[model samples]
Target chain A: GSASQTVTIPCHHIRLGDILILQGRPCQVIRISTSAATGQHRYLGVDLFTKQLHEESSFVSNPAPSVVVQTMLGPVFKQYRVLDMQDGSIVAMTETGDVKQNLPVIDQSSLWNRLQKAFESGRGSVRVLVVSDHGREMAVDMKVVHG
Target chain B: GSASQTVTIPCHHIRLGDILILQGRPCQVIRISTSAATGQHRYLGVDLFTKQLHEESSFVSNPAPSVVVQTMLGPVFKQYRVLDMQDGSIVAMTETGDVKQNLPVIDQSSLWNRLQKAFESGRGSVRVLVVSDHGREMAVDMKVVHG
Candidate 1:
């Protein structure tokens, strides 16, 4: 039910939390700017389902440029607790219900070893930052919640 | 006429220099691997029209996975010689056709000053590596072609 139909809105009328259809994907607006002389609106947002910088500029005419806004169905971040770890992947349990989901790790950088250690110690648990949009799920970050 | 009508090919049949459709975008396959146990093929390629890593995995059920391959109408690389410098951008002349086009500099990194100096002196000229796909064009690299 996420990907609802989008509406066209003037670029300047967009707000901070507006969802935009960018590069054929959904993006949540984080920062933006506009110009009169250049006849344009520039945007810097994050991909709804995946973590990527969405930077683009839309040309404007006499009136401000209008773009497709995805205010209905965009990525939503959810907090989840880690129940199991598999390499860079994890089995995380949701807070609302005891639902478990296998999440893929896109970035295998640091904090991964810390996540495994914290999970085994029981004194700590992992707080997974999950962003889901358009029926796809993945973990962007895993924080070791030390108690 | 890049953005050509593509045909589906088995993932395992994909090779280097092949253009693949990953996430609905054309990507020129640079490196790839196949796994029998995982029943899949993984690819690391460059986006045809954009400068980004196109990494994806295709699931193989039985007869190996098949994917949309863009052999034609994909991005093609051409060489251009720089003529004038405007900020970090350049007005480059094509080597073969001698057509001049305005090229934008995406990366505001080093070697830009070097590119400018080489242009003014006439002893050196910058060579631009351009990839054009779907009627869009951009430069990925600028080489200080010092003679």
Candidate 2:
């Protein structure tokens, strides 16, 4: 007494387990059971890799050495030689000029008591914070105020 | 009528099927058809996989037979083990060995009237009915088997 009928199984255009029914649904990816002792084909194999346009994403320019935040509250010192900066944000330079600010300062217990009173008032110990915000012609927004 | 006039579309240096400005709204993911004797990569290809974690459980130690209620047509032989435990219904167990001061103990409506008088003593009697408990394990489930 067996009759549930609905057989259509006939797909395998080769190329490592094809099975891409697409419209009926079943974008191939299979393998489960093989090999009793290395007659080759040892269980689990699904191959049909495709994503490649020179392996995706291309555009390179990797110049390193950048860590500057002066003293969001100390523990961020490394100006590896950031020489000149009227306002291009101090690009490293030190032969004996003093300008060390190599990123690393986040102790937010609600601004850890105004950064311990700006490092015990050692003359307004630098503490700037603006993690992200870069705009200039990328108009979805634009505003500048200086007075 | 397609003319919104604004065509610069040339910033150069876009290695493959170029089209930048993602944030300014311009998307991409391409692999322009290919198949010269299967070098693959006809549309899209990306692979990065990780998997290794498996678990299973199952235990058995059968024995559950009890029932003794003679005469008075003893509820038509426990109505054939109550319609054979209503087509097999045992989601879980432990009826703590029924014993309401014993007098005619035969729980679950006396085995569903002994499976509805063994399927009304008909032709070609029904088969297949198995049960077991006590011996630990059986927890790896995802079932759908129909031949």
Candidate 3:
């Protein structure tokens, strides 16, 4: 299981270009109308995935969820062997010993430099972290464990 | 000078949250009020750079410029020497013989394959493209020039 960060906001604060989750469907607000007497804010939006028009309403006292996909965007960590940290690319291997080519160097913190130096000093594999999100994966972190 | 692709849009079609250039300054429209009696579409926006409120109006027949920076986003090509293609990383040198470390393989086109194959076949320098944009540069294209 992974963690998520979802935020809810009142309809009164929802702008015309805001995204909201309406009736379990993620929608993009294209038009918003408010009634001064009843405090009802109605929204005309388009389904994000289907691109169909959807109408929903929220009261001044109620809050609606926004961006349904934001709840599942937790970091998916996978183990990869840091075989090469040359240039701006990090070559690694899958957990099953298969080669993972073209793994990008995501960051340049002290840990990456340490891994690069280790590979430069000794031509061997090191332990690594490959974090994935929304089908995009890269070498986020690495450690030296020469054998 | 870099090339531009600026697009102009009439105020009648401009929706809320649309970015517009106001008197040569880029702004994000927060609210739009259109008069039915008159053909005036007044836009209340905020300065994109300064975050200050700015008001601009457009006639039914007029078009406004959008996003001043998009015009200068032309690719800035630079020369670099490909010194390494080990693992997934590529080592290169600057035009003045300075070491340009950590350049990513920008694409996987046939040209890149040809360059990679040349480096794998030989261990010498190859002419490469390090395109710069807003200071983030990478090896976008490559060619083998044997020495």
Candidate 4:
């Protein structure tokens, strides 16, 4: 059992796929850049668990940013932008307008899942309803938007 | 002369106007709520100095989140939603869809500022560039998003 520990390295020394312990969580580094004048480093990564963008950094030390994690009751939900019609394709966009398309939809099953499957994923948005038990769909909690 | 200490308390015990000392930073509690089944508490507040939402909570004890404080940058940038066009009204939304409206826009003066001001705030999206200098503008190197 490897307990999580703070691993600090020189910012520029960091490499792709390295885990930068940010705010006590492991963020997988996907990109790295250095400042020309200061020789400082900039990082962009995603949380290992939540799939959210980890905070950016210009240095190698742990700043331990504050976070609030919440656990919700039944009928949880998620939203995504459909980018293709086949294979449950989705596209994630970055602030810089870069696009990552064709992210695989994870394993899920429900009327919502069935509808998503039948819809032939394309450029659009869809919301999924999740629960703690036997999956059921409620229309009130479901949404789809098209561009 | 008081040193900041982390105090663990039931999330419900926190209230509006309460001071939550997180990571040696003082955050003022602006909102609080409790879940029905779990009775866990959730908190929403802003950092006293940074003006960022400190963090949300659930079933609170004192969890001090870490953060980075960057000072002396020109035209700090932030993202928000234009809630209404009248009175330059707007709201900030987090990725979780949490909404904080009626935030006062402060200390903006530049072509960028004037364009944002003249845009007539409404239900849409915008990114603000904050500054502490009289300079006109700089390449985008700073930004923060609020909810």
Best by lDDT: 1
lDDT of 3 by residue, A10-103 (tens): 2323566555655445555788775555435667777544568887666332111211111111122355776765677777777567786777
Alpha-carbon DockQ of candidate 1: 0.01
Please, what's the RMSD in Å of model 4? 22.2
Model 2 misplacement above 4 A: A1-147, B1-106, B109-111, B134-147
lDDT of each residue in A1-147, candidate 1, tens digit only = 554333344442356756566665667678877544553567777775566887777743322111112122222345577777876678877755465556765553555665667677772346776655465666655654443
DockQ, prediction 4: 0.02
Comparing 2 with 3 on lDDT, the higher-scoring candidate is: 3
User: Which docking class does model 3 fall in?
Assistant: incorrect
Give the candidate number with the greatest TM-score: 1
- List where candidate 3 sits over 4 angstroms from the true fold: A1-147, B1-73, B110-112, B121-125
Candidate 4's error at A15, in angstroms? 31
Model 3: colliding residue pairs: none
Stretches of model 1 off by over 4 angstroms after superposition: A4-41, A44-75, A108-111, A121-124, A144-147, B1-147
Q: What is the Cα-based lDDT of residue B42 in candidate 4?
A: 57
Docking class of 4: incorrect
lDDT of each: 0.56, 0.22, 0.53, 0.39
Q: Which docking class does model 2 fall in?
A: incorrect
lDDT of 3 by residue, B37-95 (tens): 55356677765445678776663321112111111111223557787776545777775
- For candidate 1, report its TM-score: 0.32
